[PDB]
Amino acid sequence: NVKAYELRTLKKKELLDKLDELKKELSGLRISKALGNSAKNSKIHGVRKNVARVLTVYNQKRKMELRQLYKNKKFKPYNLRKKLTKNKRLQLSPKQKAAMTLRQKKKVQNFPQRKYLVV
Amino acid sequence: GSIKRFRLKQRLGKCRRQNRPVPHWYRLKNTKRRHWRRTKLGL
Amino acid sequence: GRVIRGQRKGRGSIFKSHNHHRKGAAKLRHLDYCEKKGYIKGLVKDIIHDPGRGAPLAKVIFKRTEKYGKKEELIIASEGMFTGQYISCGTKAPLSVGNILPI
Amino acid sequence: IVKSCHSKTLDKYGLIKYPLTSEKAMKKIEEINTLVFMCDKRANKKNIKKSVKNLFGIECDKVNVLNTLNGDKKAYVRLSGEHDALEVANKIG
Amino acid sequence: GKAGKGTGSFGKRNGKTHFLCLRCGKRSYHLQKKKCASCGYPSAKKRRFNWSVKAKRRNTTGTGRCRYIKTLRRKLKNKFTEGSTPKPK
RNA sequence: GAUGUUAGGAGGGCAAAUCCGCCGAAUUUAAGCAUAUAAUUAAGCGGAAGAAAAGAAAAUAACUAUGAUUCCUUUAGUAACGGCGAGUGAACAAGGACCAGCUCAAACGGUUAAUCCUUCGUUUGGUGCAAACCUUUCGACGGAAUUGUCGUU
RNA sequence: UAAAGCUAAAUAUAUGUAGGAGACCGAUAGCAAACAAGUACCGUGAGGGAAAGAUGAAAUAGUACUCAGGAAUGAGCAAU
RNA sequence: ACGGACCAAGGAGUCUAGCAAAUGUGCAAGUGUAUAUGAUUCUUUAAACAUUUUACGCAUAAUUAAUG
RNA sequence: UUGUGUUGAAGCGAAAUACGUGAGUUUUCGUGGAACAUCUCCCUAGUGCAGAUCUUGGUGGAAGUAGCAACUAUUCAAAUGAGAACUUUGAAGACUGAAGUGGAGAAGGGUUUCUUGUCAACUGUGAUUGAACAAGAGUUAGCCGCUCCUAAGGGAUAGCUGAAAAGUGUUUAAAGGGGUCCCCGUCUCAAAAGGGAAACAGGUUGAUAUUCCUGUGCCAAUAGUAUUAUGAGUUAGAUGGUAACAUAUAUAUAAAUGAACUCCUUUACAUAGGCUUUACACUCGGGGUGCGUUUUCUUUGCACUUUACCU
RNA sequence: UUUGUUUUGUAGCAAUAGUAAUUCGUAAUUAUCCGAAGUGGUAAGGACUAUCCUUGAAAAAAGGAGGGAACGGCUUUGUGCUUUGCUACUCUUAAUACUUGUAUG
RNA sequence: AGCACAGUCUUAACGAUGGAUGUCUUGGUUCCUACAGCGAUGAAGGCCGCAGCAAAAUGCGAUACGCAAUGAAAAUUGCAGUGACUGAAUCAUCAGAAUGCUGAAUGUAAACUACACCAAUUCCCUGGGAAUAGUGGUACUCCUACAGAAA
Structure with a gap:
């Protein structure tokens, strides 16, 4: 039974071959269960969750390196760019929405709505 | 019939798997x- | 009332022609310069039966002139045509039974 | 789109589920030198041959395959005459 | 006569006209004209009709898993920036 | 024009209570029924948003005049329509809610498209642990555009 | 001042989601469904479409023991 | 003549609009404060309370197709 | 407003020297086990049932009644079991009668299959049976099929119509392949009886077999280079016969040069009639082997005496 | 090197299998499996005859042909083309070894 | 140890059958309030799976009745088992990771787990070392830019 935080420091090797041995022992447990031997059947849950934890750490490492590889570059793949709602993606940017012509801009700068008091 | 398609056989x-009783425990x-x-299954 | 039998014919559902064993449309040769200015002879190779019609159909083999090869035409056989006969079609074809001429 | 996770293609652990130990499968081992394995339905003859080769150091003459009504695939793997199914079955249980 | 109007002709009732319809999974796929009588599968659209409230409501949205929209629910009241995580303990 | 699995992108489907176009009945009422009514409705087809649509007068009035649109109270079951039968049926003013105005075209600028987009870069400072995000102006490159972009009003 | 264009608010919401309420219904009522309900089941199909809530404070008190019965059960000088 | 084998539970002049009459109540040549606004009320309260000395309905005048 | 409840509320059963004229009201005993009134006045409504071939649910008389009638037919003994007319075994009498309740398949079904249990319900009598219930198991293919081809035909493309939905499907189409510029050319689906690459026998399990095992075959595929080896041919492609035509037997008849471009053949086809050949079927006689009859007759009656694909 | 006479072999498969028997510890030994015909039931094939105002699919796939484009090997001139000295030389089936991504089903 | 005729009908008590009544109610209904689109970045819907013993419903996706992270924080249990003396047992949150086959479904198809073509592909170390027949891409229409042919 291993936790995610201790193996967060491992290299991808120590991750993948540990997964390999974890899968191997899970297969051995499943073979024993396939036979009549059911003494160790309850260890299958723990081994399965260990496999999940190892895969989680490995895949998060890989996603982080793959993000570093595309840092900036303005042309990240779709799975890397933002997963907002499609409508949000197609929305005009706030700058585009607020963009105004020179005529409107020089009107609003020279005559802005202003605070005052009525006696 | 003896002749079947893969999807029909899987169905x-x-x-058959769902026609089993509730586990005693x-x-x-x-x-x-x-x-x-x-x-009849009708499917 | 309801739609009468004559009106149902144009729908063409069960009133389409039974044409499964038809051997092909009976058309004579498409106009060519050979037909227009001279003659071209093709030989009749078989005289067959078209199940729809009563008239026999002659399979006339012509030799292609724009390229090497043969072309097969399905003609309505005139009475007296025989296999192995040479039919001549064109402006200069002689006036004889079987030949295709301008009227 | 690029994938960062490790492949979810079925490897041997998952291609081969477990050996069959029913009376029929059991007697096949001694009589006709054949091991009966249970596999995922997505395995094929080549997959099973290679997978048992890399799971236990044994090649086979032939694999016969059927799909059961229980949702998995039964593989009758006839071992080569050079070795025997008895010692392999003793090695794995 | 013998395969008469009722019981006799009911004996000749083999050979279905509908099967499972890979889209809606319901046995309404007409085999001869290759079209689901329930959902009109080969066509892009879903084949609904306003004259059947029952039919609409037994296969509307929310009848199934809502495998994705149920996840994106509640995002509006959290407003987490995509990619963000809670601060580690 | 054609063609490109050239680069970058978009549409498709679901869902509909409210909303926008189309298409479009009959039951019913008339104590029958045909115009009429039901109804510019139901059904059918398509299309959007958190609202939509309408909207800044080719508008009212006839006053001492009002001043984009929408909605509420009213006008008013009124003017009017109608086998003038059954039935149908608005508008202006008035009181309120809310309140907002604008730009193309056309005119003017050729001692000089003053415009725009693509790609590639540099730094300008910021809040994130990170992931990411907001600012940023100096270009260059390749194009588009005089069959007309931009500025002025 | 037509034959080009944009525009927030006041407005509507038998949908979805989430809150809050009521001189509402109280298991033949209230949604079809208080429950494994658009489920079981029916129809080739479009479609049609139910019934069914309540031990007790506590089963962490769900009936131990004996007798008679092949058993189901029953009876008790036995029992919660 | 028709309906009713039996029992339980369910089961039918109601709701809204509009008009009138009757009667009760308030005010009275008036009456109703509509939409809306305000206001230390904001569980109840979606109700109560309020309205800087020409909103509108009905009434206060009839009659005529009508100029009136 | 002012009250009753665990010292027992509501409800319900039977009732009362009870009140009322009457709808009712109020009490008692029992049961019940947690709520209930308010008649002080008033507000409110989904407010009062004998009927509607009313709705839903339950239950009667009919009535231990009608009935449990096609398919000629059962019997003796034993086993199992709590229990046997309808479970199993042996014996008998019969039936189906190769146009079969006999073997193989399709459609349809979907685990009903098999083994072991097993009887609450079902198996319209019984039931120890079962296609019921329960636990496990069981379906093995290069050669059997699908998969490929095309048919009647379906869908789609280009257009063109139509508000669209849809309708039609070459009606102004610049619409992958071949050799090396030219030539050909809509796509796709539609047959488990049509067309079609190639398998036989013996054996084997509780349950699978042209699928497993054994033996023997067959079909298709088999890249490039290099070594060998088999064969031909050649000092750029063999030879016999007058002819019809024939010839490569190497483990294996593999090789007999051959492009573009063509032209054919096979695939590939109805019905009727008889004649004919072959295989299988049936039958007769002989021989051998076994069994049967045997008061009498009987050189006798019966069974076996087999041989796949491939070459 | 041909024509007659014999032996063998169920022509190979093949008897080793199958069947029916006799025995033996309880898995083995043994012996047989070969001489002549008849009827016409089924199926298929053949060669025919007849019938049609009915003439009784297609394609995948395979084959045959007509035609005659191209042409040895080692080395070399010059610019795939004339050339020089020399002859043991091309196709086909099988196996092997290495490269080819793992080179059968 | 003896005695009632039987049946039919009436009454009472106690039972059977049945599920009314009463009392309950994690449900409905109506109003009010607030927010409001999801989808080629593959939706809704449909299949198929996933637990030690696991049918349904619920949950989830080959990491499969749940992983990680964050807050709480000792239980969870039918058995087996797992838990600290708090990233561990279980709740809640939920941003990271992962998300089978489909479906507008989009390489061609579809009562096929049938068939294409193009890149071989994926992982590991700091240019090598492995393993894989596996993985991606290819619809139609349209826009912008580009490309090379044409009159």
């Missing part, structure tokens, strides 16, 4: 059962 197997803490002759 037949699924129906569970019952100590089913209505949707069918017989091959009474109610």
